[PDB]
Design a protein around this ligand. Sequence first.
Ligand SMILES: [Mg+2]
Ligand SMILES: [Mg+2]
Ligand SMILES: [Mg+2]
Ligand SMILES: [Mg+2]
Ligand SMILES: [Mg+2]
Ligand SMILES: [Mg+2]
Ligand SMILES: [Mg+2]
Ligand SMILES: [Mg+2]
Ligand SMILES: [Mg+2]
Ligand SMILES: [Mg+2]
Ligand SMILES: [Mg+2]
Lengths: 110, 48, 201, 103, 117
Amino acid sequence: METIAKHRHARSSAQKVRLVADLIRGKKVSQALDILTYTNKKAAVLVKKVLESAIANAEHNDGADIDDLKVTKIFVDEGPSMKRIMPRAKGRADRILKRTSHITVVVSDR
Amino acid sequence: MRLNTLSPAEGSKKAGKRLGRGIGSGLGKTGGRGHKGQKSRSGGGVRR
Amino acid sequence: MELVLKDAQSALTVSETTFGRDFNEALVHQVVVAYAAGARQGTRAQKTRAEVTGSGKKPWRQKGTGRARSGSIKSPIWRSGGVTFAARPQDHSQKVNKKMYRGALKSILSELVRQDRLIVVEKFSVEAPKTKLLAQKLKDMALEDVLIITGELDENLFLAARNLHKVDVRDATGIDPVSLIAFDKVVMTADAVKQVEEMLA
Amino acid sequence: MYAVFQSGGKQHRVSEGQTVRLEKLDIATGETVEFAEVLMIANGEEVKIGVPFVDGGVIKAEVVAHGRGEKVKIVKFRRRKHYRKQQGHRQWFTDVKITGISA
Amino acid sequence: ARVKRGVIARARHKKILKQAKGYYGARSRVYRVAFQAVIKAGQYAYRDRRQRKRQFRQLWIARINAAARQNGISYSKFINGLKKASVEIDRKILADIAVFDKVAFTALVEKAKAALA
RNA sequence: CCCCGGCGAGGGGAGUGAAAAAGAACCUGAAACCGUGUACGUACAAGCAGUGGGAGCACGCUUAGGCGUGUGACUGCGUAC
Ligand SMILES: [Mg+2]
Ligand SMILES: [Mg+2]
Ligand SMILES: [Mg+2]
Ligand SMILES: [Mg+2]
Ligand SMILES: [Mg+2]
Ligand SMILES: [Mg+2]
Ligand SMILES: [Mg+2]
Ligand SMILES: [Mg+2]
Ligand SMILES: [Mg+2]
Ligand SMILES: [Mg+2]
Ligand SMILES: [Mg+2]
């Protein structure tokens, strides 16, 4: 029984979050939560809140138990980018992209 | 004799040239104007 | 030649040159095409680079900027620019020689009698301007899609046919090439065919 | 036992019961075609190499089916010379089944 | 009568990109590069339908040469012997016999040696 | 309405609806571009990256059919528009 949680429009680039996502791909949720606790990354805090929210969905909506859950699927897709203007020297302007990402965690006992 | 059965005479409605519509048409990329010079230009050509 | 009436069962003599000539498809096609062109309204226009609202200011200088050279924001290459060959209100009506027009009607009329699509009656009228009567009358004659041509345009017959979709009445002088072809049957009174012969010499 | 015959400007090494694809023969489907032009017949260490064709050697076959081969695309292209043309092609063939190899 | 080009343009761009399946990088993704790759592929295919007939004949000749020298004669004298013996087996078949039927190939060498001697 | 969360954002249920993969960043939702999964290839190998030949593997078959599909070791030729 798969269970999904998502964080859409997370204020972080997908390239930075993917560094944390591949740390927990395939691990048991108990072991994954410890990995995210001691990963000195801002994305580790974002992924942890999505992971534990997927755990809550699995136990409250699907009645699953925490002891058997595993991170079967996790991926980070690119979200919409916010365009910003940054002035540079000699009157030139640059367009700054504040990238976002969609974080998706899928836990399952099977 | 219906509106969707009348046909023009054979050879009375020749199709016009369409310049610059690809290689297969035979008139692409120059419209039969050669390469350069006054006569190849838009509005080019000498008076009578 | 004789045109047998449908009800009186009497023949009606007509000119062989008008109702018995060959079918000139090339001639009829040109007249039919020209008639459709005459119906075109041709009311349309776009804006050239001269009519597009905007300024004649050069968007950026000729050299140095590193961009493709531009001379006007109205250029047809640009978004919101003008149309290169913007249309104007034009007239699509063609010229048809008088003899080519009349020559096409004869070829159409002679083709109708060859297809038995021309029905000749001595008279055709209804008492009151009520479409129910006319619809009943055509059902008696086994007619649904028919062009009715009369000598004198009666108002009752005109009003009774106004709401019938596949039916229309017409004066003897009001016939046109595409109407004679568009309808499955053509019903002409004995007076109308007489007036048509004088029209077509 | 196998034999070598020539058909359609090419030669084939076939054996009994084998299906071989040849060029288009003007023979209806299901008919029997004879190849009296046999170049060689080998039968268990007993080989018959023939001057022109093996004397008496005949191969009987059954026209299985006609058809057209896979479509090949012909692309001609001259760079910088404003010239290119394309053309498809499907070659007609005739499948025959070797019914008998007569020495 | 304005004509929007969107539907037919996408159709012919897909037709090119479909023929470019399996090409590396942009050659299977972007139309400008895929179109050149497809044209070049057609040129090579036309050229190689002629080269295929040369490469296979070159392969048959090499195999015949090997099998002939196993019987004590070179490819040159072997081919000349067969023509003097009026044998008209082509090189595709000779190379086929040389691999799958040694004894029949030896019989051909004997026939060729006889026409020379 | 319930659950996770910061009395957040966001999400999972429930419910509405013909449809919620119509949820307001809302008809359809192409392409570039970016990912996850699977099959195959790839760490002694030199170049317009394909093409001709071609093993092996995977898979669909049919079924002893010996075909199809994906991949492509190795090899001939090959300097984009
Ligand atoms: Mg010139
Ligand atoms: Mg030029
Ligand atoms: Mg010059
Ligand atoms: Mg303006
Ligand atoms: Mg405009
Ligand atoms: Mg006039
Ligand atoms: Mg040659
Ligand atoms: Mg909420
Ligand atoms: Mg949508
Ligand atoms: Mg290696
Ligand atoms: Mg090379």
